[PDB]
C-alpha cells in the first residue's frame, strides 16, 4: 500500500450513547423550564381559538414549484395551498410541553481503548438528543405558522369561515331524569379553499 | 490587547434553536398584523366604556395564568369598587394570561377586556363605582 | 470619599486620597497619581471594563454595548456598571471644545418604529448623563438609528448581539 | 426538624395538609399528599401521551398509548 | 342523529363515590381524586384543567369539578393564577 | 421522592430573621395570617426626595430575603408622609416612592402574583406627635400580605 | 394526459418536518439536511445546486429550497459564488 | 489549541457553526458539522452515480446503482 | 477524516501579524465584522508617481499573508492623494495606484471573489493639517472587507 518503497469495544459506544442521550435530555429540560413563560409568551394558541371554541385549520404554502415528470414534459405552478389539517371543537387549548419536552428515565443499568470509544459514544448521544429537540422545534414551529396563515388567508378572503347551527330544547326528559335546558351544537360547513379569483381582496400597505 | 465589547455569559445551542424559531414566528406575526390593520380599520375604542377616575390611578404589577373572575375581583377589591357579574359562566372557561409591570389599574382593565375578545366584556361605573363583568349571549 | 450614585455629580478628588493614605511617601503618591490620571491608563481601564476605543485621524470614537450598559428593553441606566461611565466622563474631560455626537444602534428584531423608538430613546438618556457631568447642551446632539447600517451579521448570535451599541464620536 | 426554634410539632392539619406548631404558626414541612406543591419537573417517558404500553417486546422500542413510539427510552 | 348528553357517573363523582368496579389511583402534588373504571380517569378536584383535555364535564353547587377523560400520567392545572403539574400513578 | 417542605424555607431561619428586623428597628408583626412590616421612611429615602439611598439596599435585600420564606397572591405597598407644602406635592412623592420599593422588591425574586402599589400622603396618621418631618414615626412605608395555606 | 403538478411532501420538507416512514442521512460540509423516504432523497437547504440533478422543487418566502431528487453520495453547491461540495452518508 | 493568544474558548455558536473566544473575535475552529468548509476531495467509488449497489458478488466487480461498472473498485 | 478548522489559519498568527503590522505602522483597524488596512502612500510609491518601489514588495507580502488568514467575498481597495496640480491628475493617479495594488494582491494568492478599486482623489481627508505632500498622513490607500461567517 502506499508507495512502491512503503509496499517494499463495540459496548463502549452503546453504554456512551445510553448515557449521554439521557444526560443531555435532562439538560434540554431544564433549559426549556427555566424559560417557561416566555415560551407561553411566544406560542400562545389560546389567543387563536375561534368564537365557538374551534381549533383553527393548518395551511401549507409552496412557491415557485416545477416538476419534471418524464421527458418532454414538465408542470409548473407559481403557488400552491394545501389545508394540511382540518377545524374541529376542543376544550382545551394546546400547550408548548405536548411539542418541546424530552423524556427522561434515569439509567442505573451499567481500559487500554475504552476511554476513546466511550467519549465518541458520548458525543454521538448528544448529537442525537439534539436532532430530536431540532424536530420538535419544527414540528411545533409548523403548526403555528399553519394557524397564522390561515388568519392572514381568512383576512385576504381565499378560505370559507366554518358554520355553526345550536338547536335549543326546552325541559326534556322523563320523570326518572330531567335536563333543564338542553343545547346542541354542531359545524355543518368544514372550512375551504375558493377558486373563484374575481372574489379575492388584495392588501395595499402604506 | 484586541477585545470588542459585548462578552457575555456561554450561550446553550438549545435556547439558540428556540430564539432561531422565535425570530420567524415574530416577523410572521408582525406581517399577518400588518395585512389584518389594513383590511380592517377599527373605530372605536374602549376608553368610553373603561373610563378612569381617582384611586383608578394606583399601579400594580401581575403575572397571572388562571381565569379571568378572580383577577377582576381582586383589582376591584384593591381598586375599592363593587363587583358585578352578568350572565352565564360558560362551561369552557374563559382563561386570560396578563404579564405586565407597573401600569395603572384601568390600563390592567383595559388589557384584560381586549384579551377577554368575544366571550366577555368589562364595564366601569365610577359614579356608582361599580365594576362589572358581563359574558356572551352564545351557546 | 465616593458616593457610589455618581458622586453626586461633584468633580472627584482621586490624587489626594492617594497622596494622604500613602504617607504612613509623597512622590511616590505624586507618581502613582501621574500615572493613574493619565490619558493610556483610562483608555487601558475603559479596555478592563467592555468599552471599545478607536482613534483615526483626528476623529475618535467611544463603543459602549447597550446589552451590559442599559436595562432589559428600557431607556433606563444600569447603576451597577458606574465605573465605566464615570471612566467615560473622566476620558471627555480631556477634550473641552470638541463637539460631542452620540448614536444608538439595535438589532433587527422587532418592529420599524419601535427600533427607532428605542435608539432615540437610548441616544437621549446617554446625551442627558453626558449633559449632567458638565459638558454644555450646544456641544451634544443625538440620533437613534434602527438596524440602518450595522456592523456585523444579523442572521447569526453573536453577530446580532455585537450589533446594539451606543457611540460616542468627537473632533 | 421541621418546628425549630419553636415549641415543637402538635398535630397534622390534613384539611391544609400542613403542620402546626406548638405555637400558632404554621409549618414548613409537609405531612400529606395531598398538599400544594410546586411541582415542574416529572420524570418517566411517553409523558404528555396516554403512558407505557405495557407490552413486552423482543426489541427495544417502546409505544405509547396513543401510538406514538418515544425515541428516548427506545434502546438502540 | 342526536348525541348523548352526558355521563350519569358524573353525578356519583361530584358526591365523591367512586364508580362500581374500579380501582382507586393516587394523586399527589395537589388536591385532587381520581378513578379508573373502563380505561377512563374520573377525576373530583377544585383546580381547573388546563393541558391534557377532558371529554365530559360538570359542576356542583359549592364549585367542585368532575371530569371524564383519557389516562394519562401527568395533569397540569392552574391554582390561583399560578401553573403547576400534579402526578397520577397506579395506571 | 416527593418534596418535603416549600423549597428555600426554614421557621427557624423565619424566627431568626424576624428577630433581627425587629432589633435593627423594622416592624414586623403577624396577627392570624396577616403580616406587616413597617419602614421608616429615613432608613430608605432622602430628606422628603425619592430618591433611595445607596445604603439602603442591603435593608431591601434583607426585607426580601424575609419575602422569599412564604407563599403568597398578593402584596400590598402603602406609603405614608407628612406636611410639607401641599397634598399633591405628597401625594406624588408618597406613589413614587411606593414604586420605587416595589419596582426594587419585583426586581428581586419574590414569587407572588400581584402586588399593589398606592400613596396616601399624610391622610391617616398612627401618632399625635406631628413635630418632625421624614424623622417623624408617622412617615412611613408599609408591606402587607396574607400567607396562604 | 395531465402530467402530476407536484409532490406534496415538499411542503413538509420546507417546514423541516420529516415524511413519516422516512429515515435520516447525515450531511457534511454545510447547511442542509437530507431524509431518504422511497429510495429518494429529499434535500432542505438554502444553497444552489449544480451538478446531480432533481427531479422537484419547491420554494419557501424567505429563501428555502426544498428538492425531491435521486440518491447520490455528493452533492456540487454553489455558496456565495464558489462551487464546493457537500458529503452525504447514511445511504 | 483553538483560541491561543486570546482568552480561551467562551462557547460553540451553532448558528454559524464556530467556537467564540472569550474575546469578541471569532475562532477559526469549527465545532459543528454543519459549517462552510471548502471541501474538494472526497473519497469513495460509484462517486457520480447512485453509489455502491449492495448485492455481494462472487467475482470483484463492483457495479453503480445505475448500471454502471467502476473498474477502479473492480478487482483484476 | 473531517478538516477542524479552515486551511492554513490560525488566531495566534491573526494575533501576532496585527501586533507587527501596528508596531510597523500600518494601521489595522476592527469594528464588528468589518477589517480596514490604512497605508501611507510614502511607504509603497514614490514622490506622487504611480510606480512602486522595489522594498515594499516585502510589506505587500505580509500585507498578502495576512488577508490569506480570513475567508471573504469582496475587498475595497481605494485611494486617496493631495493637491498637486488640478483634479483630474490626481484623481487618475489615484486610479493608477488602486489599480497597480490591487492587480499584486490578485497576483497573489488571496482567496476573495471580487476586488473592487476606486481613487478619490483628494476628496476625503481625515487631518485638517495639510502641508505635507506624500507625507501627509491624509495621502494613503486603504483597503477593507467584512468577515464571512
Same mark, same amino acid.
Given at each position: 500500500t502506499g508507495s512502491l518503497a512503503g509496499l517494499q469495544k463495540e459496548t463502549a459506544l452503546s453504554v456512551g450513547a445510553q448515557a449521554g442521550l439521557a444526560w443531555r435530555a435532562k439538560i434540554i429540560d431544564e433549559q426549556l423550564n427555566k424559560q417557561a413563560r416566555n415560551l407561553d409568551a411566544i406560542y400562545?394558541?389560546? #389567543? *387563536?381559538? *375561534?368564537?365557538?371554541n374551534i381549533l383553527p385549520p393548518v395551511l401549507l404554502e409552496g412557491r415557485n414549484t416545477l416538476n *419534471?415528470?418524464?421527458?418532454q414534459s414538465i408542470r409548473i405552478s407559481d403557488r400552491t395551498y394545501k389545508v394540511a389539517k382540518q377545524a374541529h371543537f376542543i376544550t382545551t387549548p394546546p400547550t408548548w410541553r405536548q411539542y418541546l419536552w424530552m423524556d427522561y428515565v434515569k439509567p442505573e443499568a451499567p481500559k487500554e481503548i475504552w476511554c476513546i470509544y466511550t467519549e465518541r459514544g458520548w458525543k454521538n448521544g448528544i448529537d442525537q438528543a439534539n436532532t430530536i429537540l431540532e424536530e420538535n422545534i419544527a414540528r411545533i414551529k409548523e403548526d403555528f405558522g399553519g394557524m397564522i396563515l390561515y388568519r392572514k388567508l381568512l383576512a385576504m378572503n381565499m378560505v370559507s369561515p366554518p358554520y355553526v347551527s345550536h338547536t335549543d330544547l326546552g325541559v326534556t326528559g322523563d320523570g326518572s331524569e330531567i335536563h333543564i335546558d338542553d343545547r346542541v351544537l354542531r359545524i355543518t360547513a368544514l372550512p375551504e379553499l375558493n377558486v373563484? #379569483?374575481?372574489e379575492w381582496r388584495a392588501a395595499v400597505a402604506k | 490587547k484586541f477585545k470588542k465589547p459585548p462578552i457575555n455569559n456561554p450561550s446553550d445551542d438549545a435556547t439558540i434553536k428556540l430564539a432561531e424559531a422565535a425570530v420567524s414566528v415574530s416577523d410572521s406575526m408582525l406581517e399577518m398584523a400588518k395585512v389584518e390593520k389594513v383590511i380592517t380599520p377599527p373605530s372605536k375604542d374602549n376608553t368610553l366604556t373603561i373610563p378612569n377616575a381617582y384611586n383608578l390611578q394606583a399601579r400594580a404589577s401581575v403575572d397571572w395564568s388562571g381565569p379571568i373572575e378572580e383577577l377582576t375581583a381582586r383589582i376591584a377589591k384593591a381598586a375599592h369598587f363593587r363587583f358585578r357579574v352578568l350572565g352565564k359562566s360558560p362551561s369552557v372557561p374563559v382563561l386570560i394570561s396578563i404579564s405586565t409591570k407597573d401600569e395603572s389599574l384601568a390600563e390592567i382593565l383595559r388589557d384584560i377586556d381586549y384579551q377577554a375578545g368575544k366571550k366577555a366584556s368589562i364595564h366601569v361605573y365610577p359614579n356608582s363605582q361599580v365594576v362589572e363583568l358581563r359574558y356572551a349571549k352564545i351557546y | 470619599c465616593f458616593h457610589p450614585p455618581y458622586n453626586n455629580f461633584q468633580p472627584d478628588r482621586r490624587a489626594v486620597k492617594r497622596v494622604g493614605v500613602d504617607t504612613g511617601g509623597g512622590t511616590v503618591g505624586l507618581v502613582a497619581s501621574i500615572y493613574r490620571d493619565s490619558k493610556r491608563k483610562i483608555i487601558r481601564d475603559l479596555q478592563k471594563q467592555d468599552i471599545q476605543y478607536v482613534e483615526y485621524g483626528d476623529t475618535r470614537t467611544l463603543i459602549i454595548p447597550t446589552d451590559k450598559?442599559?436595562?432589559?428593553?428600557? !431607556?433606563?441606566?444600569?447603576?451597577?456598571?458606574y465605573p465605566g461611565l464615570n471612566n467615560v466622563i473622566r476620558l471627555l474631560n480631556?477634550? !473641552?471644545?470638541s463637539t460631542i455626537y452620540v448614536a444608538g444602534f439595535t438589532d433587527n428584531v422587532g418592529s420599524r418604529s419601535h427600533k427607532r423608538k428605542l435608539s432615540q430613546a437610548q441616544a437621549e438618556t446617554m446625551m442627558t448623563f453626558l449633559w449632567a457631568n458638565?459638558? /454644555? /447642551?450646544?456641544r451634544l446632539k443625538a440620533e437613534g438609528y434602527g438596524d440602518?447600517? /450595522?456592523?456585523?451579521?444579523? /442572521?447569526?448570535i453573536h453577530g446580532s448581539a455585537q450589533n446594539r451599541r451606543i457611540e460616542i464620536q468627537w473632533f | 426538624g421541621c418546628c425549630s426554634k419553636m415549641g415543637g410539632i402538635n398535630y397534622?392539619? %390534613? %384539611?391544609?395538609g400542613r403542620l402546626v406548631c406548638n405555637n400558632g404558626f404554621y409549618s414548613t414541612?409537609? =405531612?400529606?399528599?395531598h398538599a400544594v406543591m410546586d411541582l415542574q419537573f416529572l420524570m418517566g =417517558?411517553?409523558?404528555?401521551? @396516554? @403512558?407505557?404500553?405495557p407490552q413486552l417486546n423482543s426489541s427495544g422500542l417502546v409505544v405509547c398509548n396513543d401510538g406514538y413510539v418515544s425515541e428516548e427510552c427506545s434502546l438502540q | 342523529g342526536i348525541p348523548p348528553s352526558a355521563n350519569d357517573l358524573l353525578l356519583h363523582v361530584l358526591e365523591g363515590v367512586p364508580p362500581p368496579g374500579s380501582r382507586r389511583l393516587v394523586v399527589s402534588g395537589g388536591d385532587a381524586r381520581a378513578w379508573l373504571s373502563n380505561e377512563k380517569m374520573y377525576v373530583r378536584t377544585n383546580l381547573t384543567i388546563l393541558?391534557?383535555?377532558?371529554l365530559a364535564s360538570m359542576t356542583s353547587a359549592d364549585g367542585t369539578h368532575a371530569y371524564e377523560m383519557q389516562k394519562s400520567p401527568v395533569l397540569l392545572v392552574s391554582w390561583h393564577g399560578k401553573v403547576m403539574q400534579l402526578k397520577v400513578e397506579g395506571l | 421522592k416527593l418534596p418535603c417542605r416549600v423549597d428555600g424555607a426554614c421557621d427557624a431561619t423565619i424566627i431568626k430573621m424576624m428577630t433581627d428586623l425587629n432589633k435593627k428597628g423594622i416592624k414586623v408583626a403577624s396577627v392570624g395570617q396577616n403580616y406587616l412590616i413597617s419602614i421608616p421612611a429615613s432608613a430608605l429615602f432622602?430628606?422628603?426626595?425619592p430618591r433611595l439611598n445607596w445604603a439602603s439596599y442591603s435593608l431591601l435585600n434583607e426585607i426580601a430575603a424575609f419575602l422569599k420564606q412564604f407563599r403568597k397572591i398578593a402584596i400590598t405597598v402603602t406609603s405614608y408622609s407628612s406636611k410639607y407644602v401641599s397634598v399633591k406635592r405628597e401625594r406624588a412623592l408618597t406613589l413614587a416612592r411606593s414604586r420605587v420599593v416595589s419596582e426594587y422588591l419585583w426586581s428581586q425574586?419574590?414569587?407572588?402574583?400581584i402586588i399593589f402599589t398606592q400613596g396616601l400622603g399624610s391622610?391617616?396618621?398612627?401618632?399625635?406627635?406631628?413635630?418632625?418631618?421624614?424623622?417623624?414615626?408617622?412617615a412611613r412605608v408599609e408591606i402587607t400580605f396574607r400567607r396562604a395555606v
Open positions: 400562545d394558541f389560546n #389567543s *387563536l381559538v *375561534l368564537e365557538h *419534471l415528470a418524464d421527458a373563484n #379569483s374575481a | - | 450598559y442599559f436595562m432589559f428593553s428600557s !431607556p433606563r441606566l444600569n447603576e451597577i456598571c480631556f477634550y !473641552p471644545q458638565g459638558i /454644555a /447642551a450646544k440602518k447600517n /450595522a456592523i456585523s451579521d444579523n /442572521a447569526i | 397534622c392539619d %390534613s %384539611s391544609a414541612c409537609y =405531612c400529606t399528599r =417517558c411517553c409523558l404528555w401521551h @396516554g @403512558g407505557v404500553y | 393541558s391534557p383535555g377532558w | 432622602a430628606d422628603q426626595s425574586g419574590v414569587d407572588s402574583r391622610d391617616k396618621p398612627i401618632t399625635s406627635y406631628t413635630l418632625g418631618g421624614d424623622r417623624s414615626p408617622n
